Symmetry: D3
């Protein structure tokens, strides 16, 4: 069995969560993206949109999450030699925090990047030995009155 958590009696307070995660890629891929030479499309813009939409779909995806009146979402990127790090900050004034929403936005944004560069990441055998998503974590969770 499962038991969802009641939140109705809790106070409405400002809540902010920041999550980060990264996708390991071939260095050339990182360059191609950085220069906007990926045929399939605008990698970073696609990932931001996918992540922002994903934040709003968190309650549909995570069984016991509650619908939350999200007031803001920011998704940014950091380039590494062989990776791209995505940061997702979610905010709201509510009765339960937004860390799961932040993690969902980060992960879907990373999945979106992967989908956009699948053609250049796969090897001669069509497999993915260089690509992987890692270090997906919550940097901070703020809850203030």
């Amino acid at each position: 069995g499962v038991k969802m958590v009641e939140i109705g009696y809790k106070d409405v307070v400002f809540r902010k969560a920041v999550a980060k995660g990264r996708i390991k890629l071939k260095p050339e891929t990182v360059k191609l993206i950085k220069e906007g030479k990926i045929e399939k499309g605008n990698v970073l813009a696609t990932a931001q949109i996918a992540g922002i939409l994903a934040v709003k779909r968190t309650p549909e995806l995570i069984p016991l999450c509650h619908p939350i009146p999200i007031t803001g979402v920011d998704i940014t990127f950091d380039f590494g030699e062989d990776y791209i790090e995505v940061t997702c900050e979610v905010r709201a004034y509510y009765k339960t925090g937004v860390e799961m929403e932040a993690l969902t936005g980060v992960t879907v944004a990373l999945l979106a990047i992967w989908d956009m560069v699948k053609a250049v990441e796969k090897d001669e055998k069509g497999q993915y030995p260089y690509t992987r998503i890692e270090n997906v974590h919550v940097v901070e969770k703020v809850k203030t009155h």
Copy 2:
């Protein structure tokens, strides 16, 4: 950016396996194993979340195509301080299913995190030790016969 045309391609059996891990406190892994997590059945919830996520893939990842998924299996492997999730997706269609398998493994892991947040957080309500990592495609297969 555009949804790449795949209509001209042959309909072949497609299978993809993705794996990922969530780092948890050893005490948390034990509570799960023992079915002592207050929020509920962690593994069944992660399985369902993942299976539904596979079917939601085209709504979450912009350029993914709608696909007649014929099967999905989500399994777990317990470590001392982690749980590894494996998602295998199958279909008889014109475009592989690695993104669907990655989406399934990802959401399953997020669902585990959500189900365990109360015991994983620290006194400061943070998640210093929790993280999702090594999310990768184990294999992508396509057969004609």
Copy 3:
């Protein structure tokens, strides 16, 4: 739990018919037939809700498969103190459509309830006369090719 594999099976014509009833005050049933329900067209709303629900079945029932539904018909039969709903779903596929037909009929019945709630409620705002009953699969057709 796992979404059972159906990929190997043959694509055959499949049809399922489900039925269900919603008990109502004979007064309410009267308003409906005359089209005096101030909230609107009860039957049309019920048909639209049921048809949409049929298509949503895979995201509502965890282990159901995405199915290329080719047709859906929702009809009504009036009783002294009830309205019977019939939902018929059709498709050429590898897995029957009984769950889809059951989902369509139940959501149609729920839509009727929502549409007439204001007139069905009693002085205490309760629903002592309203109920959905005998929801069943009238028939399941599966061609053996």
Copy 4:
């Protein structure tokens, strides 16, 4: 038809409890209690499906409003030849939650059906022993502030 205006009303505590039953072979009911249903954990799947359905109510029932649901509980009661499902929904809002509770209970019942379809079907692949009945609102609570 039009989504009735509720914006002016007061935000008060609201709770609704709905119940429903699914008739099954006493044999099937047995397998369930013992957890021998090969398809998986019937009860957990039913709870998760019902909880998700509660949140999907506004997109399933045309004229229902988006509601900040704060809690949902789905429980079971076993009978000789049936399983009774109870769904309780809570929220602090301007419009009751009876439709949400009815939706959760019905989808939970449909999930059970899907989970045990293979053992409920007869030699002709029909469902002469299966049916969902007496789906009703046990109680609707609305605080007058």
Copy 5:
């Protein structure tokens, strides 16, 4: 691109009205008026499609915020060779509702087109005469008292 922060803003009554028209053959407008369109009740379907679309706005338009919609009214005006749809949306929140009203009017018009495609097409299966036009915001209002 980012979901703009609105959490700090005051909660005020918001109302927005959007209008749009679909150019149809005069004979088509007549068939609708007379309820002779084979596909069904055109106006009720457009109303429902529009109302559900309003609630779907944040899932469709990337940077839109989830909003506690309190009411939606969709009305029609018949012309000799067109149908004008008006969608009014209301909410008590931190960010206006013009995008929600435009989404509602747009989908309602698309639904009318879908319901009438069989009589609007020409012998070549084309739609030389059908079109949606003059989709605009009639007004956007915000009140404190």
Copy 6:
């Protein structure tokens, strides 16, 4: 009442639909977008993603549309002195055409542009006297064996 159209017996043929529509904007706005100076984000990339996703959600939005295995979607733009024209081409190999999917993609892409430039389009009074969506039509519908 409504009556969905049965398509199961029809042949699977190549289908292509092209729809166009435009959004009237202030000339300065058109320039800002053209130069990528819209603070809110990448206007065109956001619109393409919104339109492509919208194509896949057509069956959820338009009540009587069928789920279709879309194989390709292309969304392009044309700049005018005071407008932006969006073209959406949808393709599939199926039993029913894709013109409603093309219209949905075009319209949501236009709504997305509107949302992205609301800040610069509105007048001193916060209204929208210069913005409107028009000439939304099907350029061609192809159905070939």
